[PDB]
C-alpha cells in the first residue's frame, strides 16, 4: 500500500479562499469526484485514484480548512462546507459527475446529489453518514469517546488541544497499522493546534440522538432521496465496519435501488487504508455501464 502522494497541486479561489485539489485523467468525459471526510484529505484517495484515472478524470478536493486548502477562522459547520463545495464544483464547470464518497464527504455528496439529481450518474460510497437515532445505535466501543467529543470543554481539549482525531481516532479506524510517513501526511494540515477547529465541529455535527436537529433533518432528507433514487450505487463495506456493519450493508443492498455491495474484507472506518486496490479496481470496473443515458 503506497505512502506517497504523487499528484500535482491544483488550486481554485472560491468564496475568498483557495481550495487545493487533485485533477488527473482525460477532460472529455464524465469526471469522478472523490470527497473525503474527517480528519482526512485527498491523501485518503491516493491509492484508489490510480485505478480510475486511466479511464476517467479524477478530481479530489481538500475540504475548506483541511488538507492543502486554506484554513480561514470559520465555525466549520456542515453548512460552511456545503457552501465551499458547491462553489468548488461550479468553479470547475462540472456538469454531470460520478461521486465517490466517505464519512462527511458522503453527507456533502448525498446532499449535493439530492439537490442536483440529474447531474449524478452514480454514487460509490463507504462508511457513510446516516441518522444514528439514539446513542445505543452508535458503536459501543466509540460511544464514551464521541460523547466526550460533543462537549465545549472536554471535546475541545481532546480534539484541538491534544489532537485526538488525528492521533487516536484515525489509526483506530484502520485495521492495519498506519506507518509514520502516512501519519505525517495526515498530521500536516493540523500542525498548528488552532487549525483543528473542523476536526471538533464535525463530530458535533454528527446526527446522533436527534442532535443537532438541522443535520438530522438534512441527513433524513438525503436518505429518503437515496432510498427512492434509481441512481446506480456501489457500496463498499468491511468487517466489523464502524458506521456500516456487515448486517447494515446487507440491509442497504436490499433497501437501496440498483445497489451493488462489495465486501473488502477486514475494515473499520477508513476502508481506503485497508483495501484501496479492491475499492479502486471495483469502481473502475463499474464506471462504463453508467455512461449511457
Query: Which positions lie near Cl ion, rule CB under 5 A?
Result: 38, 202-203
The residue with cell 456493519 is 245
Shortest CB 159 distance to Cl ion, Å: 10
From start to end of the chain, where are the E strands?
Answer: 10-14, 17-24, 32-35, 58-61, 97-102, 120-128, 233-240, 259-267
Shortest CB 18 distance to Cl ion, Å: 24
Quick one: how far is CA 275 from the chain centroid? 16
Shortest CB 50 distance to Cl ion, Å: 27
Shortest CB 229 distance to Cl ion, Å: 25
DSSP type of residue 211: B
DSSP type of residue 293: -
Q: Which is nearer to Cl ion, 7 or 45 (CB)?
A: 45
Instruction: Give the helix/strand (H/E) hosting 209.
Output: none
Q: Which is nearer to Cl ion, 56 or 102 (CB)?
A: 102
Q: Which is nearer to Cl ion, 38 or 41 (CB)?
A: 38
CB contact set of 28 (below 8 Å; sequence gap of 6+): none
Of 223, 27, 64, 35, nearest in space to 130 by CA: 223
Interatomic CA distance for residues 154 and 173, integer angstroms:
21
Distances (CA, A) of 16 to 41, 104, 203: 20, 22, 26
Shortest CB 16 distance to Cl ion, Å: 25
Q: Which is nearer to Cl ion, 84 or 202 (CB)?
A: 202
Of 102, 88, 129, 92, nearest in space to 35 by CA: 102
User: What's the grid cell of residue 182?
Assistant: 502516512
Active-site residue numbers?
103, 127, 269
The residue with cell 448486517 is 247
Amino acid at each position: 500500500i503506497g505512502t506517497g502522494f504523487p499528484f500535482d497541486p491544483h488550486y481554485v479561489e472560491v468564496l475568498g479562499e483557495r481550495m487545493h485539489y487533485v485533477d488527473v485523467g482525460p477532460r472529455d468525459g464524465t469526471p469522478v469526484l472523490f470527497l473525503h471526510g474527517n480528519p482526512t484529505s485527498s491523501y485518503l484517495w491516493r491509492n484508489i485514484i490510480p485505478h480510475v484515472a486511466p479511464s476517467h478524470r479524477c478530481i479530489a478536493p481538500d475540504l475548506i480548512g483541511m488538507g492543502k486548502s486554506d484554513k480561514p477562522d470559520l465555525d466549520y459547520f456542515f453548512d460552511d462546507h456545503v457552501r465551499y463545495l458547491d462553489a468548488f464544483i461550479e468553479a470547475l464547470g462540472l456538469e454531470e459527475v460520478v461521486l465517490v464518497i466517505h464519512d462527511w464527504g458522503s453527507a456533502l455528496g448525498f446532499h449535493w446529489a439530492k439537490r442536483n439529481p440529474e447531474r449524478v450518474k452514480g454514487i460509490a460510497c463507504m462508511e457513510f453518514i446516516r441518522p444514528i437515532p439514539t446513542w445505543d445505535e452508535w458503536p459501543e466501543f466509540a460511544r464514551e469517546l464521541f460523547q466526550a467529543f460533543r462537549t465545549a470543554d472536554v471535546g475541545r481539549e481532546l480534539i484541538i488541544d491534544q489532537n485526538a482525531f488525528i492521533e487516536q481516532v484515525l489509526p483506530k479506524g484502520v485495521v492495519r497499522p498506519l506507518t509514520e510517513v502516512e501519519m505525517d501526511h495526515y498530521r500536516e494540515p493540523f500542525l498548528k493546534p488552532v487549525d483543528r477547529e473542523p476536526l471538533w465541529r464535525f463530530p458535533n455535527e454528527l446526527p446522533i440522538a436527534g442532535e443537532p436537529a438541522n443535520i438530522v433533518a438534512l441527513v433524513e432528507a438525503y436518505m429518503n432521496w437515496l432510498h427512492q433514487s434509481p441512481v446506480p450505487k456501489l457500496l463498499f463495506w468491511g468487517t466489523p465496519g464502524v458506521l456500516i456493519p456487515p448486517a447494515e450493508a446487507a440491509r442497504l443492498a436490499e433497501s437501496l435501488p440498483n445497489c451493488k455491495t462489495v465486501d473488502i474484507g477486514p475494515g473499520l472506518h477508513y476502508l481506503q487504508e485497508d483495501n484501496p486496490d479492491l475499492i479502486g479496481s471495483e469502481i473502475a470496473r463499474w464506471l462504463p455501464a453508467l455512461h449511457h443515458h
